[PDB]
Design a protein around this ligand. Structure first.
Ligand code: FMN
Ligand code: FMN
Lengths: 147, 147
């Protein structure tokens, strides 16, 4: 089982969430390839992967803005090979704002219109993800559980 | 049965969608109160209504921006009386862009965190809603059908 985890993180919260998900996946036998969105090119990005998990934090004045390193990948998701792909999404956010982890719905919606098979509701973390450890760990165990 | 329909529309597409939904609801016996979001104040807005339907088009450079007359209502949705409220959302958009009818997910997500009961997946219209008439009519009939 091969997993690709791509994260867009600016203050490291979503990356720490991505490290946590990866440890639980590797702990379970999965060969997990974890890449920072600022380093990938969408072209054929998911090829060869049994499971893709994408994480992205959210920002914006009013509007819902995706983490800047993630925007490029999101703009070209139709080129990543998502058609029929097992996927699920997660991301950190903050309920003080208006659009709680809005980047997650946006990615989910587009993956869905792209034929990807979303295997679990996205994980949305409020505040320090370090205080959400069992939620992350639990969310990865249930996603391995949905495949 | 009393229905409130609030729409945020800039070029009139979502308002025409809102007129269509209203005709099918009134055609069915519902007493339908249709209000342009630029005219409401969120404070107690849904009081006394058996069904609330909110429509909003989407815009934004990159980001996902809600129709400006709708932003105020969306920023104060926790004050509208959504807790346990039968609701569903619709809106026009355009697939040429990146976030297809992204305002709809955003409103749905917040209504859900606010305890509203979403009675049907939101209706998302691509292009001229006038060419989507049976989809709108059909979507309102199934939402009356979900209550
Ligand atoms: C200007 C600004 C706008 C923000 N907007 C949102 C938002 O709309 N929704 C949300 O859930 N969090 C929002 N946040 C909170 C961040 O997403 C939060 O700090 C998150 O932990 C960042 O993850 P990062 O370390 O992974 O990239 C915003 C923060 C700032 C400074
Ligand atoms: C600058 C700009 C950004 C837009 N962004 C989006 C978008 O992100 N998603 C979408 O589905 N449609 C987008 N649209 C298309 C409009 O939402 C579309 O014209 C819709 O019919 C407008 O409804 P209106 O008459 O109800 O308010 C955008 C249009 C412009 C001019």
């Amino acid at each position: 089982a091969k997993a690709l985890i791509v994260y867009g993180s600016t203050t490291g919260n979503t990356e720490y969430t991505a490290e946590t998900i990866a440890r639980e996946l590797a702990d379970a036998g999965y060969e997990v390839d974890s890449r920072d969105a600022a380093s990938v090119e969408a072209g054929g990005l998911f090829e060869g992967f049994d499971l893709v998990l994408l994480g992205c934090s959210t920002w914006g004045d009013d509007c819902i803005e995706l983490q800047d390193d993630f925007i490029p990948l999101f703009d070209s998701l139709e080129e990543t090979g998502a058609q029929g792909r097992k996927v699920a999404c997660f991301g950190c956010g903050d309920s003080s704002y208006e659009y709680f982890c809005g980047a997650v719905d946006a990615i989910e919606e587009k993956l869905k219109n792209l034929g990807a098979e979303i295997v679990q509701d996205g994980l949305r973390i409020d505040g320090d993800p370090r205080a959400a450890r069992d939620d992350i760990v639990g969310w990865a165990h249930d996603v391995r559980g949905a495949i």
